[PDB]
Amino acid sequence: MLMTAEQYIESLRKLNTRVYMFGEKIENWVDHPMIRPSINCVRMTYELAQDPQYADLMTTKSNLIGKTINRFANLHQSTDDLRKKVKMQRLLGQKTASCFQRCVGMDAFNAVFSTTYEIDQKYGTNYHKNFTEYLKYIQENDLIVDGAMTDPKGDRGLAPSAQKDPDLFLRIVEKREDGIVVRGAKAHQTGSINSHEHIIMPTIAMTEADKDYAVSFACPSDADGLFMIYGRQSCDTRKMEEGADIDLGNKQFGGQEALVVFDNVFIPNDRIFLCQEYDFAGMMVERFAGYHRQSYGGCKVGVGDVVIGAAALAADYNGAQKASHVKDKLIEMTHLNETLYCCGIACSAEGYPTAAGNYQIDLLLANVCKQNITRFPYEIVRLAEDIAGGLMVTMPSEADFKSETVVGRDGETIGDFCNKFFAAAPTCTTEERMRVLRFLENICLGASAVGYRTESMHGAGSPQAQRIMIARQGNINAKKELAKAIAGIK
Amino acid sequence: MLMTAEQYIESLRKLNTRVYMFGEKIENWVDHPMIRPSINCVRMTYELAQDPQYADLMTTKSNLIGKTINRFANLHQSTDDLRKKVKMQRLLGQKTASCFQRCVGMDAFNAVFSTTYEIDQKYGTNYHKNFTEYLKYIQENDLIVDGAMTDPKGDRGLAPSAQKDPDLFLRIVEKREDGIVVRGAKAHQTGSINSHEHIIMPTIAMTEADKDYAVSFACPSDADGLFMIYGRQSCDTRKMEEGADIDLGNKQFGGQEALVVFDNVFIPNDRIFLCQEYDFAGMMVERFAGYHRQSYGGCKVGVGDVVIGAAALAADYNGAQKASHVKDKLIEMTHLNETLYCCGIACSAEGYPTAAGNYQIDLLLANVCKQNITRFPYEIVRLAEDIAGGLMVTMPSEADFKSETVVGRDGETIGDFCNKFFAAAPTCTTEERMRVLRFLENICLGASAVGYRTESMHGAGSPQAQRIMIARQGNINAKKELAKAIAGIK
Amino acid sequence: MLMTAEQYIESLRKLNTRVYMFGEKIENWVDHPMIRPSINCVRMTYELAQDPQYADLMTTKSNLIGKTINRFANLHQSTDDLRKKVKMQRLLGQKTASCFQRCVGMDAFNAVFSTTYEIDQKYGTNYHKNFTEYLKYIQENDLIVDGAMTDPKGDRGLAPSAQKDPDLFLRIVEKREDGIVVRGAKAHQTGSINSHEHIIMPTIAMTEADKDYAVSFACPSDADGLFMIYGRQSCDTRKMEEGADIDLGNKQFGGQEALVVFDNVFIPNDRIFLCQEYDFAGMMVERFAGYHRQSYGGCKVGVGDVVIGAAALAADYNGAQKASHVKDKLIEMTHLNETLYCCGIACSAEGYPTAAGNYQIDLLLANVCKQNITRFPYEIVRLAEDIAGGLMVTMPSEADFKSETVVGRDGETIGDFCNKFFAAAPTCTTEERMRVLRFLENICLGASAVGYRTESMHGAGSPQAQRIMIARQGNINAKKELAKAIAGIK
Amino acid sequence: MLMTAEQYIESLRKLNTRVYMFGEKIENWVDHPMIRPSINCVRMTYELAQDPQYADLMTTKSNLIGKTINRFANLHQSTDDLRKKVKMQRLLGQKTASCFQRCVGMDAFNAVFSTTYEIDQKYGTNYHKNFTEYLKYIQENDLIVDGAMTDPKGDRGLAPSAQKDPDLFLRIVEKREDGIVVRGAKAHQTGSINSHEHIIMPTIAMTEADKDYAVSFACPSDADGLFMIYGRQSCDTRKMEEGADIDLGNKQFGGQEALVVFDNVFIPNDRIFLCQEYDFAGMMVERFAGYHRQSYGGCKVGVGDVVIGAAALAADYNGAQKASHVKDKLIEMTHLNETLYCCGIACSAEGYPTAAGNYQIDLLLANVCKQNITRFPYEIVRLAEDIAGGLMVTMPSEADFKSETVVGRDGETIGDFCNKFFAAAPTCTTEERMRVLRFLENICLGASAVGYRTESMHGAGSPQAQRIMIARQGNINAKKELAKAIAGIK
Ligand SMILES: Cc1cc2nc3c(=O)[nH]c(=O)nc-3n(C[C@H](O)[C@H](O)[C@H](O)COP(=O)(O)OP(=O)(O)OC[C@H]3O[C@@H](n4cnc5c(N)ncnc54)[C@H](O)[C@@H]3O)c2cc1C
Ligand code: SF4
Numbered sequence A, B, C, D: 001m002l003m004t005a006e007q008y009i010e011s012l013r014k015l016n017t018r019v020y021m022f023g024e025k026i027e028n029w030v031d032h033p034m035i036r037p038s039i040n041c042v043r044m045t046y047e048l049a050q051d052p053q054y055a056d057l058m059t060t061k062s063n064l065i066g067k068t069i070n071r072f073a074n075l076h077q078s079t080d081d082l083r084k085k086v087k088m089q090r091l092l093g094q095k096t097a098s099c100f101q102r103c104v105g106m107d108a109f110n111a112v113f114s115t116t117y118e119i120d121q122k123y124g125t126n127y128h129k130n131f132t133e134y135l136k137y138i139q140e141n142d143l144i145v146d147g148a149m150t151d152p153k154g155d156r157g158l159a160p161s162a163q164k165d166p167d168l169f170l171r172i173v174e175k176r177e178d179g180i181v182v183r184g185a186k187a188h189q190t191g192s193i194n195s196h197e198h199i200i201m202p203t204i205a206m207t208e209a210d211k212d213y214a215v216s217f218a219c220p221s222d223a224d225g226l227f228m229i230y231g232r233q234s235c236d237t238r239k240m241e242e243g244a245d246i247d248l249g250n251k252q253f254g255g256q257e258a259l260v261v262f263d264n265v266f267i268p269n270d271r272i273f274l275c276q277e278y279d280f281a282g283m284m285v286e287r288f289a290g291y292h293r294q295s296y297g298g299c300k301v302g303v304g305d306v307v308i309g310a311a312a313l314a315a316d317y318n319g320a321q322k323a324s325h326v327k328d329k330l331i332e333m334t335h336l337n338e339t340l341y342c343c344g345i346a347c348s349a350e351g352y353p354t355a356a357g358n359y360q361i362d363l364l365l366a367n368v369c370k371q372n373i374t375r376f377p378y379e380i381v382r383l384a385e386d387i388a389g390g391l392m393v394t395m396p397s398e399a400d401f402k403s404e405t406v407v408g409r410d411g412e413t414i415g416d417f418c419n420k421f422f423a424a425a426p427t428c429t430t431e432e433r434m435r436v437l438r439f440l441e442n443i444c445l446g447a448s449a450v451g452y453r454t455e456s457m458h459g460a461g462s463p464q465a466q467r468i469m470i471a472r473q474g475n476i477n478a479k480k481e482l483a484k485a486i487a488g489i490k
C-alpha cells in the first residue's frame, strides 16, 4: 500500500520516539511548531504520489514485491530509472523549496543492496538476504527510513580506534548469539525525528584495527536505548511566535537536524548488514555518498528554481524588472542552476549495473556534480540578495504591520505607517511584497539557508573529499600519454 | 570634553526617544536585550578614546574649537588623516566584529561641510555657517549623530516627484519664516535608536521638478513628531532567551536597524543645510557615499580579521590544522581581506582638499573599494563554513549542554551526552569549541551576517550604483587615444 | 564505401579549388606547410574509421542508403546516437588536440534535414527532397562538407537589408528558371580549403525586408566564381622554417580558417534548400547552432584531456609533481573539464525527435554547455601556464638546441649549453622537456590557442547570443508562481 | 647627465656584446628586426625624461651625487617617492603597452643598497661601499643595468648543492686575491641584450651547504666570458616580413628575453656585493622581489589602460558600442585594472625606512598586489576577446589587403575584396579597424601576450611563492586571540 499524507502523520503519533529539546522531553513532537514543518515537508512525498498528474513519476511497480510502490523505495533497474530519480527530486524541490529528507532512505537502500551482495560473496554471510527481506517490509508498508552515516568523529587527526574516547564513532560493544549491542551516536541527521526506522552505515574506510567500527544495520525509531536531541537552526524560534506566518518565509515546510544517540542498542541478527568485515566499509561509503551526490543535481536545482522565481518576482514588485543588469543577473542564476542539473543527469545517463544487479551512477561525474554544489548555491543566493534590496534584512515584524497601536499626530497606527512606507510598484500590495522578501531572508540567511547553503557545502562530504577521489578517478597517467603522442615524445 | 562609555550610556537614559517593536512602545530601551548590543558596540568608540594605548589613533585636535575631540567627529586635514580614519575603523572592527555605527556621523560631517560651502558660494545662503556652528556643538559635547540618507523610495521605476504617494522620499511640506516642516521616513537606519541627533541628506541627484526633495538638516533624536520602528534581524530573538550566551555567538556587540518616521517635524532655520537648491543634491550624495565607501576598507577588513581568526581556531579545535587545503583556504581569506584594505588605503592616499579645505578621497578608487566589498566578504564566509564543518548549523542549544535531565541507562544527563559526543582535539574543552562554532554561525547566517554580508552588498549603494560611476570616472575616451597611438592609427 | 586517409588526400589533389595567401595563388596547397596540418587533422576521421578498435564508434549503418557510413555523415535516430556523437568527438580531440573540422558537416546535415521538412509542409516546396538526394550522394562518396554560416556582417548596429553595402550578408542577386545566382562571403571558415563541398546557411533570423538573405544551398568547393583567402594564425609562419618540428608544439595537426568569397556563383535548382522563406531562417540558425553547441562538450573536452596530461607531465619533468598546490591545480583543471562533458552528455540524453524524425538536443542545456565553454578553457590554460613555468615562453629556438657553433672557452657549442642548462629531473631528456613545453606554448598562446581559447569564446555565437536564449527558454514566469505558492501569495 | 633616446641607441653600437640566435652570432643586433622593438621600448624611458611635460615625474635630484638623474636610478627617500615610482610605471605602460625593462635596475639598486649595509654590520666587509661607489658611476652615466636573479634551477625538488650538475645555479668557482671567478647562467632575462651592465643576485634563501651560490655582483655586458642566447616569442618572426606593420599589432615596441651565460667570468673585488655570507641571500631575494611585486602595480595597470582603450575602440568600429553587455564588460575590465593599482599604491603608502636609510614597501601588501597580478590580466584579456569578435584571430595578411592580384570576374583585386568585406561602422576605414584588431591579437595571443599574461603569472615568482609568505605575514595567531575575545573564550 501507499499511505496518504494524513495516514503518514497519524502513524507518527503512534510511535514511542524519544525527542529532547532545550533540556526537556517533547511529548507531542508531531504538533510542535519547531518540528511540524519538517513533517509537512516529507509528507509531500506521500501527497504527490496520490495525484494522478504526478503518479507516473512518483510511483512504480516494485520488482521485489510485485506491487506499486513509491519511487523513493525502489531499486534502480536502468539508467532511465537513474534519470527519473533526479527529475522526481527536482519536482519535490520546486514544491517545497527545502530538504524533503526521504532521499537518504532511497540512496541507502541501493548502496546497501549492492554492497551486501559482495560481502556475502566473499565471507559466506547472509547480509544480502537480511537486507532484501527488510526492504520487502518497507515496501509493503510505505515507511520512512533515515539513512545515518556521519558520526561526531572526535579528533579529526586520528582513526576511530585511536580516539581518546572510543565512543566517538559508532561501534559494536558486545556480540550475543541472537544479535549485537551497539554504542555511539550519529550527528546532523535531517529528518531522523520523523522517521519510522533508521539504517546505519560507517562513515569512512576502515582498517583491521578499526574493525568494530565496521557495522551496518536497521532499527525502529523507538528501539530500546535510542533517543534524539534536536539541533538548532538560524531563526528557529520565530516558529514559536503567536500567529507566525509572514516572518517565516516558508510557513509550511522546513528540514531539521538531530543528534541520534545509541545508548547500548540491541540489534537482532536479521537486521544486521555489516559486522566487522572492515574491507567492505569503504565500499558502502563510496556507493551511498555517490548516490547522495547525484541526488543534489535534482533537489538543489528544484529549490534553485524557486529562488530564481522569488528574485524575479521581487524585481517586478520593486519596479526594477526592466533594468538590463537585473535581467542579466537572473540569466546568470538560471545558467549556474542548470549546470548543476546537467551534472546530475549526466552521471545518471552514464550509469551501469552492479554485480548485485541494480544500477549505479558514474562516480566521477557524481563527484563533479557535488563539487559544483559546494559553489553555485552560494552565488545564486548572493545575486538574489542584490536583486531584492536591503529591506529583506531590515523589515519590521509582522506584529508591527498589523499593530493598531496609535502613533501618528492624526491617529495613524504603526500598521498604517508600515503598509504606507513599504509600498512599491502597482503590481503588488505591501503584504505581497513583504511575503516574498521574507521568503528570500529565510533562504539567504534563515532556517532554509542551513539546507541550501551549508548542507550544500558539507552534505555527502566536504569539498576536499570529492577532490581526493576526482584525482584518483581522473586517469591522469593516461592523459600524460596523450600529450607525449602529440608532442613527439616516444 | 570626552565622555566615558558609562557616561554615554547614562546620557541615553535622559533622552525621550520614541522606540516601537512588535506593536509596543519600549520604555527602557537602553536595557532591552535586543537593543543593548547596539549600544555596547558604539560605546567601544568612547572606551578606546580613554585608553592611552589608542589615544593617538582615537583622538585629535579640533581645527574649529582647539580642544581634543574623538576622531569620529574630525574634519580631515590631510591624506594622513584619511589613512588614520581607515586604520581606526580596522581597529574597531577587530574589537567588536560588528557595525559600531559612528562612522556615518563622521562621513556626513565631512560631506555636508564641503558641500554647504559650495552651495553658499553660488546662492548667497548661510548653510555653511549653520553647519559649522552645529559641528562645534557636537564637538563640545561628544555626541552621536545618525547620518540618514536612504528613503523607502516606493516604485523604483519613478522619480521622487512622480511617485503615487509623495511621501516615499522625505520632503519639505511647509516653509515658514522661522524654519521648515518635513514629512517622510528614512529606512535601514543602523544605530538610529541610540543616537543623540540625526543628520538627514537626500538619496539621489534631483531635477527642478524634485526640488521639494532637496533637503538636508539636523535634529535631536527626540524632536517632536520623530519616532522609530525596529527592523528584525536573523536570529534576533535568541537575545530574549533566559541566560542567553553561547548561542548568541557575539554576546556583547551587535548593530540593529530601524525605520525613522518624520511625522510633520519642524526644523528651525539654523539647523538647515539644504533647502530646494536641487542642483546640489547630487554633490551631497556623491561625497557622503564616497567617504562611506572608503570606510568599508577599514571596518569590513577588521571584522574579516576576526572571521579569519575564528576559522583558524576552529581548525585547531577540530584537529585538522595541519592539512594543506585548510592552510590554503586561510591564505585565500587573508588575501581577499587585504585586497579590501589596499583599496581603502589607496583611495585615502590619493585624496585632496575640497574648496572648503577639508580632505576628500579619490572617488574612483573608493568606488572600486566598495565594488570589491560586494563580493569578497561573501567568499570569506563560504571558506569559513568549509573549515568549520557541519556542527556550526546543527548544534544542540546551550540549555541542552547545561541540562541535568537524566536520559542515559546509567544516570547520564542531556548535558553529559552533549559534552561527551562533541569533544574533539585536546587543545580545547567541548564548551570552547562550541563557542567559536556559534560565533561563526552568527556571522555566516545569523544576526551578524546581516551586516557582514547583506550590508556589504547594499551599504552605500547596490553594486550597479558604483558601476555607473566607474564608467563615468574611467576616462575611456582618453584610453582609446592611447590605443590609436600604439596601433598606428591617426 | 569508406575512403582511407590516403585516398582522402589524393581526392583533394584532383579538385580545382582556388586558394590565395599573402597575395598569391597557391597551386599545390595540399602540401603547403601552413595548410597541410588542417588536412592531416581531418584525415584522422577517416583513419580511425578504418581501425577495428574504433570502428564501432566511428561508423554506423545508414537508414538512408542501406550501407555502413562514417558517423560524421549520419542522421541521428535516438538519444543514444546523440551521446555517441559527443563520445566520438572526445576521442578525436584526444587524438589531435585540435579542430578536426568535420563536425560542421554532421551538424549542418541534421539541421537542414529537419528544417527543410517543415518548410515544405508550410509552403508546398520540395527542399526536403533536394536535401535527402544530396545527402545520399555525400554518404555514398564519404566526402567532407564545410558548413558555412557566419557572414562578415558589416555595421553590427544594422540589419542585412539596411547595410551601406548590400553584399555584407550573402544574398540572392538573380532568379533564373534553372537556378539562382548568389553574391557575398562567409568568414572564419575552418577547414573550408580542404573540403569537397560547402553547405551555406543564413546567420540570423530574417524579416520580410531581409528575404533575399534567407538562402541555403550546397555547392562543390571548386564551383565557378568560388575562391578562398587564407586567414592568419598566431605563430603560423613557424611552419615555414626549415626542419620545423619541436618549435611547432603540435607538428602533425592544426585547424586553419579562410574567407570564402561567392563572386556571382550559380546554384542549380536541385541544390537549393531555402530561397526567400524568411520565416524559416531563424529555425535553421537555432538548430545548427544548437548542435554545434552540443559538439563542444565532446571536442573541447578531448583537447582539455591533452592539456591536463601535458601540464601533469611538465610537473614530473620539472620535479615539482609532489607539491600539494600542483596536485590541487590539476584537480581543478580536471573538475572544470568534466563539467563541460556533463553539459554535452546531458543535452544529448534529454534530446527528442523532430517532425522529420531525426533527433535533436535539449536547446537550453546546449546553451548552458556553450556558456561554460566560453569560460572554462581560458581557466584550464591559465593553470597550465602556472604549472609549466616561465621557460614555455622564453625557450631558445630548436636551431639553437642543435647548433654546432662554438661559443665556450673550452669548445662548447650553443647546442651543448642549451642541452646542459635546461636539464631537470632524470625522468626526461632535455629535448623531451622542451617538447612538452612547446606543446603548451602552442595551445596557450600559439596556433592552437586560436581554437582552444578564441573559438571557444565565439564559435556558434558570442556569449551574449546564448544569454538571450537562456532568458527565453528559462521558464521564468512559471518560476515566479512557484515562489508565490511557497510565500503564501495568491 | 641624461642621454637622449638617440644617444642611448648610439651607445649600444659601441658595446661588444655577444648575441646568438638560430645558431648564428648577430653582429648588428641593434638594427635586427626581432630585437630593435625591445630597444625602442627602453629608449622611451630616456625620451620621456627629455620632455618638459613629463620631466618632473621622470627625473629627480640624486642625494648621492647632487645632480639631476633619471628616477629609474634613484634610491627612495620617502613613501612619496614610492608612490611616484608606481605612477611613472603606469605612464610608461600607457606609452608603450609593453615591458620597458628599466624597472629591474631601479629595484635591484634599492634592495642591494639596503642589504649590503646589514651584511657589512655583521661581517666587517666592504660591500656597502662597493655598491655606493658603483651606483655613483651609473648615476653619472645614465646607464641601463639588467637585474638578473632567476637561474635555470635543474630539478625543482633539490637545493643548489644537491643538483647533479652544480652549474644549474650561478656559483663561485675560484677565489683570488684580487676578485672571484663565477660560472653558470640566469634565464628569462628581459632586456639583457640591450643593457650596458648586469647586476646579479641569488634566487632563493641559502643554507651553509649552499654558500658558494650566495653571490651578488655587477659587470659590463661585454665582460670576457659573458654571452647571450635569444629566447623565442609567440609570433616573433612576423617582424622579419618585408614591410611588416599592421600584422605586428605594436610595430614600435616589445620586450624580449635571453639566457645569459657566465662562462668563467672574472669579477674584481670592488664589483662584489655578496660572497658566501649565506645568511643574507634570503634578505636580498625578499627585498628585490618585494620591490618588483610593487612595480607591477604600475606597469601592468598602464598596459591594461591600453587594452581597455583598444576593446572600447573595437566596439565603436564594429558598431556595437551602445550594447549594455559591452558597456558592462568595459566597466569590469576597468574595475579589475584599478584594483591592481590600489594594491600598488597601498604597499607604497605603508612603506618605511630600512636600517640603511632608503625606503621599502610593505611586504604583505606587495605580495597581495602580485597575487592579484597572476589573475586579473588574464580576465581583462578574455573580456577584450569577447568584445573584439572572431576576426582578431582569422584576419587575412596585410600582404593580401594590399594585393593587386586580380581575382574578381570584373577585375577586382584580392585587396579590393578584403577592404570591401571587412568594412563595418562609418566611424572607421577598414584599415583602421584591422589595426586595432591586430593590436588585440598581439597582446591576447602574440608577442605582447608573453609579457601581459605569462610574465604576470611568473615574474617576481609563481603564485605559490607569494602564498607562502602571506601565511607567514598574516598574523594568524593574533587573529585567533581576537576571536576568543569576542566568543567569550578565556
Ligand atoms: C616572460 C618572463 C619574463 C621574465 N623576466 C625575468 C627577468 O627579467 N629577470 C629574472 O630574473 N627573471 C625573469 N623571469 C623569470 C621568473 O622570475 C620565473 O619564471 C619564476 O620565478 C622562476 O620559476 P620558473 O620559471 O623556474 O618555474 P618553476 O619554478 O619551474 O615553476 C613551475 C611550477 O612549479 C612550482 N614549483 C616549482 N618549484 C617548486 C617547489 N620547490 N615546491 C613547490 N612547487 C614548486 C611553481 O610554484 C610552479 O607552479 C621572467 C619570467 C617570464 C615568464
Ligand atoms: S539535501 Fe536533497 S538529496 Fe539530501 S535528503 Fe534533502 S532533499 Fe534529498
Ligand code: SF4
Binding pocket: B098, B099, B100, B101, B102, B103, B104, B292, B295, B296, B299, B300, B455, B459
Ligand atoms: S557598516 Fe562599517 S563604515 Fe558603515 S557605520 Fe558600520 S562599522 Fe562604520
Ligand code: SF4
Binding pocket: C098, C099, C100, C101, C102, C103, C104, C292, C295, C296, C299, C300, C455, C459
Ligand atoms: S571546434 Fe570542435 S565541434 Fe567545431 S568543427 Fe572543430 S572539432 Fe568540431
Ligand code: SF4
Binding pocket: D098, D099, D100, D101, D102, D103, D104, D292, D295, D296, D299, D300, D455, D459
Ligand atoms: S614587467 Fe613591468 S615592472 Fe618588470 S621590468 Fe617590465 S615594465 Fe618593469
